[PDB]
């Protein structure tokens, strides 16, 4: 009827939209849970790794003439990198991450560093390739899962980027997963690696290693939320004898790239979890908002139907007599 029919169309489309965003909410929740399960799968390896690194740094008292991955002697050319999520509508994710990126690259151009930037999400590199004012190259992508081969590709490129002292102080912008509503994107130094193992921050909440964060999704009174687990992995300091087949230097030079790769894959996994949870809270807000919209539009459609039919009946009855 071109008046009621338009409103029937909008009611149907908003109901279908609510159904679709509810499906996207449940899909994003399952994706967050499977990324959390991948992190729980990867946690034994990282536990034994932050125990073995303490073991090696306990044998040798950081007495070493080696380890190119600890050339900490200047701040010449930082290589900031951003791990970003590759989806549409992405909650409020991309703007936040590249906003922190733009702030820190401005603060780096303050120091005159000629920052080269590595993009990890396709949303990220699509944003980055539009503007070359920021010196950016070597962008990669791993989506829907951080695969060990893709994390190893990132490890290979950043390690080959550090083997030249062109690039030092390689800090990264990974979005840690603090809360379901909003997860602030933190900035952590990666490659100097602080050979005692402790991966430290932007100087004021810097983390000691083997004190690990493993986020766990449990429901509160009733809702979905994430609760952290600050589990501290106990370390058996050394084996009773602890022979070496290698030298004390070669073992660290072959071990610290492994921990670099582990930390890169963790900064992809937690970034992916935070992105999918931002998309999930966007879907939940959108579904509840479309529920409110469907209710209000149904009310408008009902009063429109009553007005239309009543006007029709008044036309008919008043034209009946025509006295």
């Amino acid at each position: 009827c071109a008046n009621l029919r338009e409103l029937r169309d909008r009611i149907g489309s908003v109901k279908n939209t609510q159904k679709i965003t509810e499906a996207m909410k449940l899909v994003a929740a399952a994706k967050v849970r499977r990324a959390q399960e991948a992190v729980v799968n990867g946690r034994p390896f990282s536990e034994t790794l932050v125990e073995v690194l303490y073991n090696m740094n306990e044998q040798l008292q950081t007495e070493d003439v080696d380890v190119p991955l600890t050339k900490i002697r200047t701040v010449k050319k930082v290589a900031l990198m951003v791990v970003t999520g590759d989806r549409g509508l992405c909650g409020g994710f991309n703007n936040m991450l590249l906003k922190k990126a733009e702030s820190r690259i401005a603060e780096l151009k303050k120091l005159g560093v000629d920052y080269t930037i590595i993009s990890i999400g396709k949303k990220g590199n699509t944003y980055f390739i539009r503007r070359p004012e920021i010196p950016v190259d070597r962008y990669f992508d791993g989506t829907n899962l951080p695969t060990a081969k893709e994390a190893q590709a990132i490890a290979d490129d950043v390690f080959s980027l550090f083997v030249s002292e062109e690039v030092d102080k390689v800090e990264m912008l990974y979005t840690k997963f603090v809360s379901l509503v909003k997860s602030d994107p933190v900035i952590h130094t990666l490659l100097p690696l602080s050979p005692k193992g402790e991966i430290c921050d932007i100087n004021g909440k810097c983390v000691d290693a083997a004190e690990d964060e493993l986020f766990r999704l449990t429901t509160k009174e009733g809702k979905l939320t994430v609760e952290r687990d600050m589990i501290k992995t106990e370390t058996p300091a050394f084996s009773p004898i602890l022979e070496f087949e290698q030298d004390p230097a070669q073992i660290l030079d072959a071990l610290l790239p492994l921990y670099l790769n582990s930390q890169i894959l963790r900064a992809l996994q937690e970034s992916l979890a935070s992105e999918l949870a931002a998309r999930m809270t966007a879907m939940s807000n959108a579904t509840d908002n479309a529920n409110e919209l469907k209710k209000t539009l149904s009310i408008n459609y009902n009063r429109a139907r009553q007005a239309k039919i009543t006007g029709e009946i008044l036309e008919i009855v008043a034209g009946a007599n025509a006295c």
Binding site: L26, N302, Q306
Partner: protein, 247 residues
Amino acid sequence: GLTALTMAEYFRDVNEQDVLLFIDNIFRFVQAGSEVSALLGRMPSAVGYQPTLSTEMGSLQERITSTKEGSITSIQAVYVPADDLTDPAPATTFAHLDATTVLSRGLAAKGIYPAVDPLDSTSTMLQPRIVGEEHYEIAQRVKETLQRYKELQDIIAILGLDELSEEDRLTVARARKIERFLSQPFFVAEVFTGSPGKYVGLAETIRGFQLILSGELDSLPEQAFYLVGNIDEATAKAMNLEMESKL
């Protein structure tokens, strides 16, 4: 409708007994009134029900009152047209209705007979000064628990009962026990299945729901609560399953 009204009104005002009066859809009565008024030619009102809609259906539904002889409490089906309580006939009906309980097709397909929706069914008589403070408190807590369950039914599809918090995993378990305890074997379902059927007054279900929701019965199996009457019979069903658990 008026014939049923007076055939039950004579019952109450001669025998002084609690008479029931089942009307099929009040909207069908109102539709008949609309037909008869359009036939009389009196100018139709809003959406198209008769002008004397409120007065007509008030004459139908005001003789349904608890006189000092004995109540004539009635149960009236209501078929909202295009499912909106706004239009006059469901509006002038819901101005009268004192307790509205929807029968749910999903609950029927599950087999939680009676299929009355525990959450959306509302009554103006639930309030504490009417029922009793304990009844209002336990009823509000059962409805809040079933609300928690309808919320977490989205998330136990993804996480599972053990993954989410054990604080409200007890809420999910008690909500399962409540939704099962609500299903009563009737005195008519015997002809379909042979279940003998149990009649449950308010005292028994009050104490049983307080025992379930407080948490004394946190270890009884869920299916020991399904299709049972009182709480003691439910524990009898549970210990029956326990006695057969050896074999």
